[PDB]
């Protein structure tokens, strides 16, 4: 049995030792330490050599090579509005995860940040005055409305090409296919989705129309009717990523559809081997967002022998620390 | 200037008086009282007749549903359909008291499956290992046997066969809302929310319909019978049109996530809902949309500036039946 | 096994049936139903006749007669600022509970409401403007500063008498003794503490000085030095209420010291027989406020065979409903 | 106008840069950055010298502690003393970096008991029955053997005997803070927070000191040796005087409850703290003082209007060591 003991600042300030001490500090600090261990277990399993074949690509319909552990990373839109956008972009840029799952805000806000920035503000700011000045609030963040005007100008010509390619080149569009195209078009190394499509990391977002991107598509469809986005084919693509995995881990930031969609794909292989949740949602109202990992065990979305971890924390604080002690330590092994 | 005072039980248990007294009790009790006022304002507006000019603009809807002076969007998370709030929602839909539903995938199939097999009471603390071993799945403090989903598979597969056939031979262009209407017709059971929704021409939107057991079944089905397409773009036009050509709109949103965002974003298209009540336990401090106060939506134009929206920070399983008792259920005669 | 089913409004509106249906509705509605049952179990045990003696009074040093179940009711100050003040006053007026535990705000705000009201406001109101207008915010409630001026005028002459009685009539003051005296002085049937002292229900508040009452005592002590408030004797009084109980129940609204103090007194009898918590606090930071009842079982503050219930809810909503279906149904049996 | 940008790990793991980048990351990460700025402002003020006039007013304190330009109140709940944050708090107290402590009863005795026997890591989910049967008590995901309290009984009883004797024969008028100072002297262990507090003349206030294991022991003791009095009125004068004759005040408050309220109410006596940082997970919507935003305290005059207080919505076990690393620990040389 391990004793409780916090970091002793009489040693001075060594950050690596400070973070290691979280494991024995208790409460959510201990769960953070447990999360470092689970993610490092995922990474070490991923780095094990493997031997397998063209077969894989025919049943997944993916160009992505299999590894010894397929890592699903899911995150809510607000985290793409935050600086965790840079954290996620880093992992995708270096091919450290295999599948992304977000909400529609979580696609478009990455793209818009390549056109214009998001600013710091305060939770307290009143909507009346903000609206009168053309500013939209996201938590304690602020996005000028003009940001979406620039987004519209950038996007309309691409939508025109997508409709044309659909009606004459046979393209059957889905959200993931669309997200890849937008990342290719934004063509900017600051963008998560630019790196994802370059590295053949698919992005699933079955509610992609539920945001500003949806708005644009709606307005565009009266100037250029025709665009269809199918969600059934994306279901086959994400589920096959899970079924034909050697091992799977889930890193899930926040709740909602991103949490559920990743968990349900792993129910196809009767469960994920590793799982970390980081969110502030609570169980007591029965919502999937607030459920402990152990609920997902009852369903088989996480294997009974797994040691899943939830850290009850704002991921804006915890996720960069987690990456610092896990993925960022093994950068040499990813090149 | 309104003074704080609680209900005095020296008067006896006068239930209506006790509920009315929440308004002056403070904290979330006062917010409940404000939510009752906001929903009654939605209902009073809804029953007001359309002038000639208003009728002209609302008829632009190519939908069969009679247009009213207030189009009410009801959104709820899947857990509430697993709960007994399924019963509350079904009643409102049965009597045409709301006009548009928004939910998540689980929120469709658990209503249908409850017409095949029940959900049971459990405890939050039950461990996943022993439950999984006995083929019981946990939803909060509720429990659903795996057998339930088998029954659902046997029921749904044939319908999936027919939908593919109608897609391919009759030109049907399926969307989530059209599939949900169809599944409601098939279930053909007056205990079902979606049975009543399709009977009463109340559309159901669920852009992430594939993310659950229904998706599992579509996925398996697609291998013995491929090609089913569910387009989300057409549904986006359909929900947005409900908001654009409304004389007035109200939002009643239970929980967070896509249901909260999708309803509010549809109302951005008319420069804001006139009335809105949120009921949920999510907190704002992580910047989630689920935990945002209504005043954030005001920032965006999703709720009008002159509106007086209300958030009640409570589990809807407690609050929503009380809210309905004090609002819609008092005007039942006006809806039949 | 019980099926989930909510109330069917096709029956019309019968509130008693509506509340009963919470038990089968799920999530916190089910826990509410479980709480109704636990409190009704407490009340039914309390109403069982008993046979015992003067002995009791000598080891508790209390005039309160023993019953078959001693009910401890604890609540945080904010609930005395709310209308739950009326709910609590009703239970105390009719001798339905045996021991009260609150914080200091929870004493003085009951007394002040007999001099001037608390008003409705909003959580959003900014402190700068409120302070400039002499208004203090409590959640979405508002208390003018003048309220505390009236309180000061009312209280100073009583403090003078208490110091005099201490230094010449031997009175050894404690918080509970003081709270009884203040309830006697306010002499107003709207006051919780007026009814508590009339019915010999003791009020424990070991941090009584941590509020406006504390302020006043502080200022008074420079005009009239001498007042001592001992907490050791109040410890003996509350613990003996628990030790010499036939059975005990705890109804605890909110967290903090009120939750802990009641639970620790019941650790003296190796546990309470019935227990209901109503609060919105969460466990994940390890605080006693957010702990589930099952933590208290590990300590022996609740008996292993008990079936304690926590309702995760604002007590301003839930407590009047709970009382309506429990204590208020048995009013005839309390007269 | 400050843009949102996160730390770019393409730069490597530069820990100081990563922590500084929280300020522009958003949500609670930005609040952490603001908390670092507020605490560094407290520290910079504290190290500024007292002018002649300022020295004159602060010396009015009849306390031994050297007065500084900023009196810092550190408050924390009992659970944090059970956690490894005990280690963080002890360091600050050891090096005279704070001036007044406020805690709850558990917050005193668990520090002393850790000098007799350790606390262990557990899980939140461990069931109370099997723990009780094996004489293990649960504190969140931490575990304390019952034996710990037996060791504490054997250690404390003799001291209680002496305090009664000094009360009765030497005229000692005991209060919670005086008892805590005495228990710190007795423990005589440099791992103990209260050892260092009494060594450095840092008073500890705990009006509800009786509400826990220490109270249990006082209670039992009072039967073989009655009469111990702990007066809370004198301690009220003592904490209030620390605030009234301060040149400047800062509050660092971890968690809610009496510690939060008592520190803030002491600062009402000077018409407000100049600096304040709250770290806790409590929510405002039930109207609790624990969950109130700092701006509520502004309403009361507990925090000055011109202050820029900060609440970080996080478990302090995560945040507080990071905060200390970026503030107090960078100025260690100035405090020795």
Residue numbers in the entry:
A (entry chain A), C (entry chain A): 28 to 80, 82 to 363
B (entry chain B), D (entry chain B): 28 to 363
Paper text:
Hypusination is a unique post-translational modification of the eukaryotic translation factor 5A (eIF5A) that is essential for overcoming ribosome stalling at polyproline sequence stretches. The initial step of hypusination, the formation of deoxyhypusine, is catalyzed by deoxyhypusine synthase (DHS), however, the molecular details of the DHS-mediated reaction remained elusive. DHS catalyzes the transfer of the 4-aminobutyl moiety from SPD to the modifiable lysine (Lys50) of eIF5A in a NAD-dependent manner. Recently, patient-derived variants of DHS and eIF5A have been linked to rare neurodevelopmental disorders.
However, each of the affected individuals has a single copy of the DHSN173S variant. Asn173 is part of the helix flanking the entrance tunnel to the active site. It interacts with the side chain of the neighboring Asn164 and with the Val17 and Lys19 main chains of the ball-and-chain motif. Surprisingly, the melting temperature (Tm) of the DHSN173S variant (64.1 ± 0.6 °C) is comparable with that of the wild-type protein (DHSwt) (62.9 ± 0.1 °C), whereas the Tm-values observed for DHSdel305Y_306I were significantly lower (46.7 ± 0.1 °C). Structural analysis of DHSN173S, therefore, confirms that the mutation does not have a significant impact on overall protein structure but does affect the ball-and-chain motif, and likely also impacts the interaction with eIF5A. Indeed, we find that the N173S retains overall structural integrity and some enzymatic activity. However, our data also suggest that the N173S substitution influences the stability and/or mobility of the ball-and-chain motif of DHS. This, in turn, may affect the accessibility of the active site to the substrates, namely spermidine and eIF5A.
